[PDB]
Symmetry: C2
Subunit: 326 residues, 2 copies
């Protein structure tokens, strides 16, 4: 069974899953301290519900919010929006790239306990339990990031809950992360190497896939083509077309690794951790939001000749095998 | 009228005030996400209530908790402890040394609006309003720190609430902050240069006091060495005696600046922003806690010939004048 913000669900209920999304990209405590940054908490809720409903209609039944403590994860916000939109939402524990001092001063043993509290007992005082662990690195894994990766591994081994990662920028850190995970004894089938669509290095992708890693092709709609004049847009969404990103799905299918692919939008409905009004920039690029995958991508892959059954297998079977604890 | 976590109080109700303290030194959202780091929320409350009742029995009537959003300020915690201990607590807005991305990506205009929200409307959804603005800088003022200093000057000018600031990683350094504040039109009488007891340079402090700045001699008990083993307790506390620090109070009095002096402990009852069990190290060197000032420093200055009325001016009159919103 899989933990959601509304409680436990069966594999069968999971359905069509977007495994890499956010309701809001922020910082710990920020939404509670300055809700007016988003207009109001009430507007943010309405926008998230009006978006999750358009995706639900397009077939989406589950999303995984990979927002950690330090990404401003507000679990009560997740519950409100999930219940209102009637779409499953899996919450995360772990540590992203903006840990405050109270997190970054902690040991591997302490960080392990923290992830365990959030998976086994609940997030804050809510009883809502994390379904996944999200970690991140920059360039070469820093000493602190190594502690986080090791703690994430130990937590996964204790609870069966999977791990999702990424490396800042377009850097290909999967091999370095994979090395640390395996030194802890973690099975690659419990790990997704995320943001893998930031690169066109197919040898890199296939090799990880061949080892059993899930390949997170999850920023498909991100593209600053047309926004060349907006330097902050480029740094965030890149210069590669969404088509180029989506073709990596085909390419990996064509190598026989369909069972290892996870597809998503890495979207959200508010963001405060970047430049002001960046949400409006993203919205002007991908008006379909979280519906971009079921609506505009699936047909694309359908057109290029991928069998419907293979897609269903990627959008339903894969997420379920991934999310289901072991 | 001065805002506290229990509502507005009149100037006469403030009494003996510790102008630079914390209930807990943490990170935003952390106490709510990992209360077990402190044993439990319930354990932290009990420890803080006992600590504040001790201070109160030593004469303390108000403290100023200078904890910002990014220092993990929890105003519901402050309200609970204030009520239980019957000690007034003034809450803070501002930015300390650990802003998350959602803060450090903001413009001067945005930070001003944030501080104003916390002073004029309330903190989070509690209706509790900040009565002071806390800012911090390092070495040479960073571009972002300059933004914070200016936003703080602007919020002060709009509300009359005072500003407390300090320089981490160096003694001196108040001149930078003074230049920036004054460039914005802020009266020095609205500004306390905190952690000033960390310097021995008396000419530097007197010069600031003569410009009208308030001098925060507010880490007196952090002198503590004893523990040569820890490169974390002599790099976070020091190597001088608390007496040498307290003598700076006498020294500024003797120069005729008694009205410009604020005195405090910079204590707390939990801390998560440094090494695990740093609280135990702190408690071992100063078991008096926030009572350190009234139990050790006051008697010490008394024995040095400082009269009652001067001591009361420093601990009662100065803080009331400082905190009373003045435009
Ligand atoms: Zn990421
Ligand atoms: Zn992502
Ligand atoms: Zn993401
Ligand atoms: Zn300080
Ligand atoms: Zn201080
Ligand atoms: Zn302090």
């Amino acid at each position: 069974r899989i933990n959601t913000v509304r409680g436990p669900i069966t594999i069968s209920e999971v359905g069509f899953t977007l495994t890499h999304e956010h309701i809001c990209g922020s910082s710990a405590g920020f939404l509670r301290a300055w809700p007016e940054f988003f207009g109001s908490r009430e507007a943010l809720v309405e926008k998230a519900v009006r978006g999750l409903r358009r995706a639900r209609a397009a077939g989406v039944r589950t999303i995984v919010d990979v927002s950690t403590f330090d990404l401003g994860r507000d679990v009560r916000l997740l519950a409100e929006v999930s219940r209102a939109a009637d779409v499953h939402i899996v919450a995360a524990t772990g540590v992203w790239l903006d840990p405050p001092l109270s997190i970054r001063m902690r040991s591997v043993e302490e960080l392990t306990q923290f992830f365990l509290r959030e998976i086994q007992y609940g997030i804050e005082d809510t009883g809502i339990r994390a379904g996944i662990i999200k970690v991140a690195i920059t360039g070469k894994v820093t000493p602190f990031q190594e502690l986080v990766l090791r703690a994430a591994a130990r937590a996964s081994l204790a609870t069966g809950v999977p791990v999702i990662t990424h490396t800042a920028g377009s850097q290909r850190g999967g091999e370095q992360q994979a090395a640390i995970f395996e030194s802890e004894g973690l099975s690659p089938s419990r790990v997704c190497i995320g943001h893998s669509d930031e690169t066109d290095d197919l040898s890199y992708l296939t090799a990880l896939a061949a080892r059993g890693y899930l390949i997170g092709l999850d920023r498909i709609p991100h593209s600053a083509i047309g926004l060349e004049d907006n330097a902050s847009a480029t740094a965030f969404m890149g210069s590669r077309s969404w088509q180029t990103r989506a073709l990596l799905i085909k390419a990996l299918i064509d190598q026989g690794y369909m069972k290892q692919i996870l597809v998503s939008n890495d979207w959200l409905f508010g963001i405060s951790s970047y430049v002001t009004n960046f949400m409006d920039v993203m919205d002007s690029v991908n008006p379909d939001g979280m519906a971009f995958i079921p609506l505009r991508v699936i047909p694309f892959l359908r057109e290029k000749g991928i069998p419907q059954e293979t897609l269903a297998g990627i959008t339903v079977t894969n997420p379920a095998r991934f999310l289901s604890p072991t």
